Amino acid sequence: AKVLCVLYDDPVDGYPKTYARDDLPKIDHYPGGQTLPTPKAIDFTPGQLLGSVSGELGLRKYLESNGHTLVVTSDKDGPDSVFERELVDADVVISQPFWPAYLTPERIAKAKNLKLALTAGIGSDHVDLQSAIDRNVTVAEVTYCNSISVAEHVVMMILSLVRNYLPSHEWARKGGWNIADCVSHAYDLEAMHVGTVAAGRIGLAVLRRLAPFDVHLHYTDRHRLPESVEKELNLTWHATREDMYPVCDVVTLNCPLHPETEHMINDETLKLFKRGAYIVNTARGKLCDRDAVARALESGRLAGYAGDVWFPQPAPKDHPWRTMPYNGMTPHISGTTLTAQARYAAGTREILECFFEGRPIRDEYLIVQGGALA
Amino acid sequence: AKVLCVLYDDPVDGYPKTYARDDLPKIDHYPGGQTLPTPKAIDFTPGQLLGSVSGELGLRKYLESNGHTLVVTSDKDGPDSVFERELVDADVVISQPFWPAYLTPERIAKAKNLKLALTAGIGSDHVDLQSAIDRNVTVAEVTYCNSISVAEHVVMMILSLVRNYLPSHEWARKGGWNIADCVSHAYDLEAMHVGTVAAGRIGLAVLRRLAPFDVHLHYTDRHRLPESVEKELNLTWHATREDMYPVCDVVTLNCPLHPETEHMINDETLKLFKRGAYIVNTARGKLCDRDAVARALESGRLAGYAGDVWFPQPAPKDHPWRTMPYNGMTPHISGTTLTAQARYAAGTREILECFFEGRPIRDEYLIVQGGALA
C-alpha cells in the first residue's frame, strides 16, 4: 500500500541527535481506563522527535519491511505541493492537527486509492467527513493521546496569566528586578472561580488538576458529568456558556468548533465577562473573535489571554495575539510534546497494523468506519 | 510610638491608579485551619499595591490616628540610608523579605528604642535573632500569609520548565511558529517523579497541587508527615535529600537556608541528579551554587532551572541565572502577589494593634517574644 504522511519541519538547526532526557514516564492507561496504544511493536525510543519530517512517526521500517510505500513531506499546501501530487494514488493519508494535511471534497475526489485517513493526534477537523463517508474512507484518530498534555498546558497557562509570570520572567531576563512592576498585575489563583467550557477528556483533566489549587470550579457542557464527579470536584454546573462567564475569574475553552461556536467569544459576549477575567484557549482559535480579544486586553475587560490555537494557523507573522498585552500564547504545540508524540506514533502504527492485517481497529479510534473492521 | 517601615519602590511608571480587577477571592483559613489575619479593621481595599513605598501596607491612617509616627522608605542599604538614620529611635521596624531591612547586631545596637521587628511576610532571615533576644525585641512574622502563593509559583514553574513554555512563548512573541523548535525540549509532566525538599506549609501545598497531575510524589524533610497525609498523596519518603535526587525528574526546594544547607546543590551533588532533571527553587538562592547550576544547564545535567530567589539579591544585572539556558526565573516576587500583600498587610496591622494595645500577639506569629504578650 502507499502511505502518504504529512509532518512539520525539523527544528531550524536540524533534527536532534541528542535529547534532554533518556526516557519517558511509564503510563498504562488513560483516566477512565482506555488503554495506551498497543501496536505489536514500535521502532523508536519514546522521547524521540517523531512528528517532524525526519522522525516519520517511526513508521518507515514497519511499513517498508511489510512491502508498503511511505512518502513523508511537510509540503502540504495548495495544488502543486508534494502532498497533493502524491495523494492521487495513496491508500493511506496521515497527518497531525499541528500540521494538518486537509482532506477537502476536492482532494478526496482526486485521491483515487484513498482507503484510510489517519489523524496522528486527536480529531478530524481537517477531513471532510461526508466526503470520506461517500468513498468508504475509514477516518481514525489516536483518541486520548494528548488530552492530558493539553490539560497540563491549560493549567500552566492559567497560573502563568494570573501570576503575571511572563512579564516577570522578561524583567529577570532583561537585567531588571522591579518587584512592583512584576506584581502590580499579579494575583494568586487560590479561591478564584474557574470555569471550563466542556468537561470532556481535556476539560475534566483540567478540572481535576485545578481542584487542589482551592479554586471554585464551574463548568458547562452539552450534558452534565455524573453526579459522583460533580460531587468529588465540588463543581457548579451552568446550562449555558453565557450563564457561566459572569461568575468566573478564569474561563478555559475546551469545546469543539462548530458553526454555532464560531466567534462565540466576541465583542458582545466579552461584556458578560467579569472585569479582569482571564481566558485560556487551547481548543480552536476561531472560537474567539481575534480582534475582539485584542480589544478586551487593551481595555482591561480581560487581564489575560493565552492559548496555543490561532486563526488562521500557522499564525501570520503579524497576528495581533503575538503581541497584545497580557498574552501567554504559544504556537500550536500543546498536544505535541515528545511525550504525546510517542503515544500517537504508537497508536498510528497500531491502527495501520490492524488496517493492513485485516484486524478490527479499536472502536474508540474510529470516526468513520470505511471498509475497516471495528 | 515610632514605626519605621521599609518597602520596595513603586512601579517605574508610577504607583497604580487602577488595577486589573475589582476585588480578591474570599478565604477564611489556611490549610490546617490557621485563621487569616484578624486586625480590627483595614484601611485598604484588598488587591491594592501595598508592599511598595506608596502603599505603606495601608498602615498610615491607623498608626497616625493612634498618635504614632510612620516613616516609610525604600532606602535601606548601608550606614547613610534613610532606614539607618531613622532606626536610631524607632520603636517598631517592619520590612518584607522582598526588600528586607536587615537588622544586624550593629543595627540593633544602634536601635535604641527598638521593641518590635515585624516581618511583613514570612520568616526572619534578615533579623539577628540572638541580638533581638538580648534586647527583649519581639520578632513576629505573618505566618502562612504567602505559603500558598509560593506553592502556586512553584507548580507554575515546574510545568513551564517541563513543557518548555518560555522558549515556546518567545517563538510566538517574535513572529515564529517553529513547532519542532518549541517541542524538541518539551515533555508532559504526567507520571514524572517529583520530589520536594521539605513538606512544610509550602512543600505540602505543592505536593497537593501536584497530585492530580498524576506524578509520583517524593519528599524528604527533618521528619515525616503523618501517615494519613503520606497515604492520601501516595508519597515516597526519603531520609535524605541525596537519597531522593536520583529517582526524581523534578526536584523542588522548599527548605530553610542553614549553615548546613548552603550550596547543598553544587557541582558534586548535581551528579546525583537524573540526566535532564528540573530544579525549582523558591526557597533561598544560596541553597544552590550559582555557577554549578549554570554549568549543569550548559551540560544538560539539568533540563531546567527556575525560581524567584537568587544570590545575591537583588540579583546584579549580569547574574548568570538571568540568561542561562532553560531558566524560568523571576525576580523575588512569589509571596508578593497583590493577594499575598492584602494578607500580610492585614496581619502586620493585626500584630501592631495587639502590640500597642497590650493584647497578646498570636503564638503562630511569634518568633521571639520580647516584652509582648503571647
Swiss-Prot record, chains A, B:
Q: Which Gene3D superfamilies match?
A: NAD(P)-binding Rossmann-like Domain
| Class of the enzyme per the UniProt entry, highest EC level | oxidoreductase
User: Per the UniProt record, which residue ranges are transmembrane?
Assistant: none
Alphabetical list of Pfam families matching this protein: 2-Hacid_dh, 2-Hacid_dh_C
| Assigned EC number | 1.17.1.9
Assembly and interactions?
Answer: Homodimer.
The task this protein performs is described as: Catalyzes the NAD(+)-dependent oxidation of formate to carbon dioxide. Formate oxidation is the final step in the methanol oxidation pathway in methylotrophic microorganisms. Has a role in the detoxification of exogenous formate in non-methylotrophic organisms.
What protein name applies here?
Answer: Formate dehydrogenase
Please tell me the species this chain comes from: Pseudomonas sp. (strain 101)
